[PDB]
Every structure is written in C-alpha cells, then in structure tokens.
C-alpha cells in the first residue's frame, strides 16, 4: 500500500464509505439485520432532497404530487440510500418549504373553514378551547378544531416518510441531516423488516398543529403527532451512530398559552406548554428486535416510548413484542422516557446519561428508566451524571415504576403469568461517581415489580465495557459525524 507524505494519519473514514454491517443486540438475535447490504448499483442512491429520498424508497415508481404527497410502490429490494447534506422533510412536491400559513392556505383550513392565516386560526383556537371557555369535560370540536385538523392532515402526509423492507439510510460525512419529519417503519397493512439507519442527524419533528386535549391527565395537555422515527410495524432494525434532538426549536420556547387559574390549576404552568414534539424513537405495537447503538440523543422531553398502552392485547400491549437494546448511547438533556418500558424485554447497557434536575434548565430531568406495565428491564454498567440544586442525586431519580395490578390480572388472561410480570434488574450503575442500586429504587416505587426471569445473554452475545472512563469514551465516539470525516 502507499501512505502519502502529506496524508492525515488521524482522518476518519472517507465520506460515503460506511456499510450496513455490524448490528448488535436484539436486532441481531435469531436472524441478522443487514438493511440494504448488497444493493444493486441501480438501488444505490445518493439523495439530497425529499423528492430524491422518496424516489429511492419507492424504486423510482413514485408520483409525488404538488403538495409532496406520495403514490407508488415501495421497493422491497435491498437498497442503500446515502444522505447528502440537509434534507428538509417539510417541503412540497416542488421542494418549496411549507410554513404554517401555507398549510392553512393549501388545505381545507382555508378552502372550507375560511382562515386567512395561521395566526388567525391560532387566536381563534385559543379563544374557543381555553379552560375558562371550554372546560375539561370533553374533547374540542367546532370550526377552529376542524381547521386545525385540515392543516395537520396535510402536514402528516408531507412529513411522514414510509420506509420499506431491506433499506439502509446512511448519512454522508459530518453534515447529513433529516429535518422536520418522521420516518415510519411499517404500517398495519404493510409491516416491514430489516432496516439500518446510520450517521444521520435527525432534528425537530415539529408538529405545526398540535391539538389541545382538555381531558388528558385531568387538567389537559397539548399533544403532537410526529416522532423522528416511529417503529410500530417493523422487525430487525439497527439505529447506529446517529444524532437526534429538537434542533433549533426547544420546548421551553413554546410555553403555555393559557393564563386562567381555575379549579386550583395555574394553567400558565409548564405542564400546559404547547408541546410540538412527540418521541425521538418510539417502539410500539409490533415493533420488535430493535437496537439503538452509539447514538447521541439530546435536548428533548419524552425520548423513548416502548409500548404505548397499559392495556394488554395482541396488537398494542403484547409482551412478545417490543424487544429493544440500547447501548453506547449518550442520553443528554432528556427529561423523561429514557426509556419508558411497557411489555417488552429491554436491555440498556453502557449508556451515559447527562442532565440536571434544575427546574430552570432547558430540559430538566424528570425521570430516567421507567418500569412500566409488564416491562422487563435489564440494565448493566450505565453511568449517570445528574446535576441539580439542594441535594445530591439519588437512585430514585434514575429509575421508577408505573404498574397496575388490575392490568396485570387482565394480562394473565391473554398471556402467561411470566409474560405479564413487570421486572427490573441492574448491575454496575454509577451515579455521580458512586454505585447506585436502581433495583432497590424500583422496588420502593412499586411493590408490584417482580423477580426478573430473563437475561439478554440467553438471546445474544455482547461485551460490557467498564464504567470508569465510559462517559469520556461515549462523548468522543457516539452520534453522527464520527464514523466518517467531512465530504
């Protein structure tokens, strides 16, 4: 070989060079994840905008309408799709970006409901639905809600991108980004399998038309519809060396818009913020065999919903689904659901959590790992740096439980006693430089938590790194822009 005298000895891999091999954890269990490895030349694409991305996913069969909406045949053949630069998913069929005003003008919000701007719609929506005008007994209805729903439906059809079988999305270099939308891994009618996503910065899956639900959590909540990645109908998915965050638009910049105080509730409080985000990566329903490795997740509220309902059932509360492995990740400035686990067997090892509890911070820590209904969590050699005022961090800050005895009983009728157990194990947890017994914290949180009856080593091999210098190692190697150097 030949090393040039002016070559850089410390350069990362060439831009555009990574492949799709290397999956670990549950994604590798039983049958391997390979994504689009081996793709024909004609299914090896470099894409730089939403239209090109869609044509790659659809094998050039897509008709992309003027609104950006898609008709075509998703391509199930192996494909390698390299992401060049920034792809804004919130653009129309001519690549012109949407704005909230455009979603109003281009949808039935204007053509049926008469709105001349998003600012007008928003003002009317707040006047109609604020707690002191609408109350909390029923969901919202009427003209401003119908108009919002028109605009939201158009946005859904634009920012949601369906990913088919045997697909690799591989960012190029240090500046591959996918903004403002939601990769959807499978649908009820068309589940998918075998997907690899690497080296991309995902940012700000912003719902421009969040709905107020007066009945949510008794007092009401704003809810949004878009994750960065939704895994509801996909199996064997490897998400590796990506970065995910709320980007330019952090939640505290969109505070409560209510100012009344009624029934003892100060509606200007932060619980009533206008939440424009949903999950980073949510694994629900028949999502299964997913590994999230070596990612940088930061600056976001509700990070990972694993299982979306306490209600046991074959479709949405199934203890045979939702097998997820998290390792080598940096969980930074996340408030909660890191991860929140119902029904699935979830392994978290060698991750680095970093945040503060301070209430004035950008995304104050609320909860770490949550053992939810019939979740089965196994945690090894995770390190947590959790700052905060008043007192030292404690294990109960980092793990808790949310379990219903009634739902466990319902579960046992549909699935077995072992399948319905809610269990938690940890070893090697470090909190602010000292040992932390997360299992004791979980037991304190709920006496319903039971003895673990699975372990991940029975399902896949792995390596546990020591915790001593793990935070530094993860900070240096995790996320997008590490596997390759700049283009």
């Amino acid at each position: 070989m030949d090393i040039g005298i002016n070559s850089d000895p410390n350069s990362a891999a060439p831009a555009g060079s990574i492949d799709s091999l290397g999956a670990t954890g549950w994604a590798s269990h039983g049958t391997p994840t390979t994504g689009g490895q081996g793709a024909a030349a004609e299914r090896t694409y470099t894409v730089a905008n939403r239209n090109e991305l869609i044509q790659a996913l659809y094998g050039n069969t897509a008709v992309i309408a003027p609104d950006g909406s898609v008709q075509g045949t998703p391509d199930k053949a192996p494909k390698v799709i390299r992401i060049r630069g920034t792809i804004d998913l919130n653009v129309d069929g001519q690549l012109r970006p949407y704005t909230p005003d455009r979603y109003v003008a281009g949808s039935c919000a204007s053509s049926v409901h008469g709105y001349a701007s998003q600012a007008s719609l928003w003002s009317d929506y707040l006047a109609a639905y604020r707690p002191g005008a609408w109350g909390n007994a029923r969901t919202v209805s009427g003209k401003p809600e119908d108009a919002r729903a028109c605009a939201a439906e158009l946005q859904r059809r634009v920012v949601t991108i369906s990913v088919p079988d045997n697909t690799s999305l591989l960012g190029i270099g240090t500046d591959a980004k996918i903004l403002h939308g939601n990769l959807m891994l499978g649908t009820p009618d068309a589940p998918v399998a075998n997907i690899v996503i690497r080296n991309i910065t995902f940012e700000d899956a912003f719902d421009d038309f969040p709905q107020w639900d007066p009945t949510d959590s008794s007092d009401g909540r704003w809810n949004s519809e878009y994750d960065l990645i939704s895994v509801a109908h996909a199996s064997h998915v490897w998400i590796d060396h990506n970065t995910f965050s709320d980007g330019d638009r952090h939640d505290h910049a969109f505070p409560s818009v209510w100012h009344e105080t009624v029934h003892g509730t100060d509606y200007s409080g932060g619980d009533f913020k206008v939440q424009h985000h949903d999950g980073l990566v949510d694994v629900t329903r028949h999502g299964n065999y997913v590994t999230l490795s070596n990612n940088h997740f930061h600056d976001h509220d509700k990070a990972f919903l694993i299982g979306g309902t306490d209600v046991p059932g074959a479709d949405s509360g199934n203890p045979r689904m939702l097998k997820v492995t998290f390792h080598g990740n940096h969980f930074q400035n996340l408030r909660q659901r890191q991860a929140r686990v119902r029904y699935g067997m979830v392994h978290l090892y060698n991750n680095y959590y970093e945040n503060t509890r301070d209430a004035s911070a950008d995304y104050p820590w609320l909860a770490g790992m949550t053992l939810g209904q019939s979740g089965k969590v196994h945690a090894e050699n995770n390190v947590v740096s959790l700052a905060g005022p008043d007192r030292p961090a404690r294990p109960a800050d980092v793990a808790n439980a949310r379990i219903s005895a009634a739902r466990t009983q319902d579960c046992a009728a549909l699935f077995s006693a072992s399948e319905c157990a809610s269990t938690f194990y940890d070893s090697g947890t470090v909190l602010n430089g000292g040992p932390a017994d997360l299992t004791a914290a979980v037991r304190w949180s709920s006496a319903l938590a039971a003895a673990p009856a699975w372990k991940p080593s029975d399902f896949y091999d792995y390596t546990l790194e020591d915790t001593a210098d793990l935070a530094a190692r993860i900070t240096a190697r995790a996320g997008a822009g590490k596997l390759e150097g700049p283009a």
Copy 2:
C-alpha cells in the same frame, strides 16, 4: 488571590472562594476596579433566585411585587454576591416563569386594550404593521403597538436588574448561571462605579415583544431591547471569566413572519427575521473604563455596541466616555459588532475569533471589528479562524468602517478635532494562519479614517501573547467554570444518622 491565565486547571480555587481582584486594561486605570472586595460580612450573600439576587443588590430594602417589579434602595456599599446554580430572571415575585400570555394578561395590553391572548395581539400586530398594510413611511402607532408596548414594559421591569456601586457578582463552581434578563450597570437617575462580574454563564436575554420598525434601515427591522449586560451609567467595570450566549433559542428559530413583496423587497428574507435578542454587552452613553477579559462569547448576532449613535453630544456621543478593553476572549459564532466602536478608545488584544461565513450556519459571520463614528480602535495580536465553503476569508471581512464627515465636524464644536477623529491601528492580526493587515482594509472601507493618536500602553501596562498558540490557549482557558472547581455536593441530614 491570582489565578494565572495559563495555570493548571487542577489548581483552580475551591468553589465559592474566588475574589474580585485582577482587573486589567481600562478598568485598572485611575481608581482601580475592585467591585465589592473587602465587603462586610453582612453584605456577603449567596443567592439562588431572582428575589434573593435583588435583595442582595438592594441591601434587603427591596419590595418585590407579585408581578416581580421592584421598589427600594439599591445599596451602594461594598457587597459580594455569589451565584449558586441557575437564576432565571424572567419570573414573577413568586418565582413563577413568565409567559407572553402572562405579560399580556397582567399589563395594559389586556386591561386597557382588551387583548385576551398573545395570539390575538400578535395576529393583530402582523395584520396592522406588515409592509403591505402599513408601508415604510412612518413608525408604527395605534392599538396593537400600544398593547405590545404595555406588555414589553412589564417584561422590561421584570427582566432588567439594577446593579449598584461597589458590587461583585461571582459565580460559584462550574454551573453558576443567570438566564433571560439584563443586568443594568447604573441608571440615569443614579450612575454607579466599581463593579466586578466573574465566573457566571449568562444566557438568552430574550424579548418576547420585539417591535417592528418600518423605517429602520428603510425597509424595516424587528428590534428587541434586552442585553445580557448594559453599561450606560457605570464607570470602572471588570467582566472576567464569564460565558455569554443566546442559550438554546438561536435566532435561526425565529425567521421572518412576512410573506409578501412590497416595493421590490422580498419580505420573507433574513433581514426581516423576528429578532428577539439585542446585545451581549453594550457600552453606551456614560459607560467608561470597562474591561472584558477571558470570557467566552458564543452564538449571537450583534455582540457589542460601543456607542449607540453617530450624533456627537455629551450625553450619548461623547469621545471622553466609552473606554473599553477586550482581551483574552473567545468570540465564537458571533455575526457582527465584535466590536462596533463609536466615540470610545477601544483596545482589543489577544482575542480568538472563530466562525464560518457559511450562510447556512446559525450565526454566519458578517463583520468583525467596525470603526464607527469617532471610534479609536487599537487591535493587537488577535487570531481569526474564519471558515467558509465559498471563498477564502479576507482582511476586509474582519474590519470595516462606518464614518460620516458631517458628524465629525459637529463633534469638533462640542469637543475637539483630535477627540473627534476616527482612527484604527492594528498589529499582529492573524487570519487563517497568516498575517492580515486590517488597517489597509479599514482605509478602503472609508477614506475618512485618520492616523491614530493614542496608545493603550500610555494608560496601562500589558504584555501581548504571541498568536502561535493563542487559539488553543483561549479555547482551553476562557469563560465560566475555569476559576473554580465544582461545588461539593450538598450535605443530607441523613448523613449525620448512624
């Protein structure tokens, strides 16, 4: 004490122990700046929220109303105020975070003008004042503007904090923060002297009620009112080892809300972004003898306005004021005004500027140092790393001039010809690894720039570091979280129990 700038980070002072000595540059000239050094024990405080901070500044004489507004007597006696953790300034008298809807509901925006929401006010404001409706021939007026002004006035009275004479604000440890407001060094009714501010991370002085001025720059601009620190009525001020930024609300998140073309102008352009920030540290009017040393300034548009008007005058365009020294700072991801200098004798030495011209960046570089009206700029051994995908950076990207001869002649009648000159000197400037002659660029920018007739070494002693390793040195050593080690964890009463 004295923590050398190139000392071992492991030898940093114990948390909560740094003092107020070390001022250099113009802040060291005349009666040296000491802040609250030597303060009585009864004027030594540790504060953790807006109410505590105000009581310390006011010597426990403040009455803080439910809305957060303040009455009382700022305390001129020497005081040392240590910042424990994060202080959010955008909160009411109960420490409840404000929202724009609260400001509308709790001000004359609602009680006089009848606005039931921020959404309604904003919708009316855009409808009334967009260029296609209002034009550009006059400033805004009428109901939505008066309602905005009501809400903005209440926010001003909450987020602006008066700092009196002989005050030190000293962050504890590596995580002292002050968010969402504006330290005001002196007020017109009560100017002050002798203030030291160290070891604090300042973020995001955000104005929830920016004003559209149709006449600004002829086509119009959105303008906001809050700096992180304003120095209009203070002399002898040392701002050292702090970090300043727009926090996590970068300007990029708030683009133009206009979508029309009027008189040939595409009003969706970036010129017309809804700017919620103003300066990082602005020194205007009678601000004088200020040194900013060893700070990290990052992620912000208009960084330092030194002198707010071209018009000469004893009040606001006074060439006997505005003496400012900047040294050892990291100026990272700042767009412009780094620094923009009118009227004052301003020395910038051994700073590291770091940015890109890439137009897709959050704060793409527009301008570096500006010789403004009657400014007297002296720049030595500054390093600039200025990237960009389009073309190499040039000296002309790093220094420019904004001078009017008519104003120069007006000035001489109030002051003198020498005091009214606009002058620029540089030596040792490095741009992207090679020397850059900024003075030559300034001369091409304006033929009205004149020969320098002052030098800072006449007024204080200083040693210039070489530029060779300066970028690395400054990156490693500047800002908050360097002077002190981290705070020890707070004790639990449980630890006493065996």
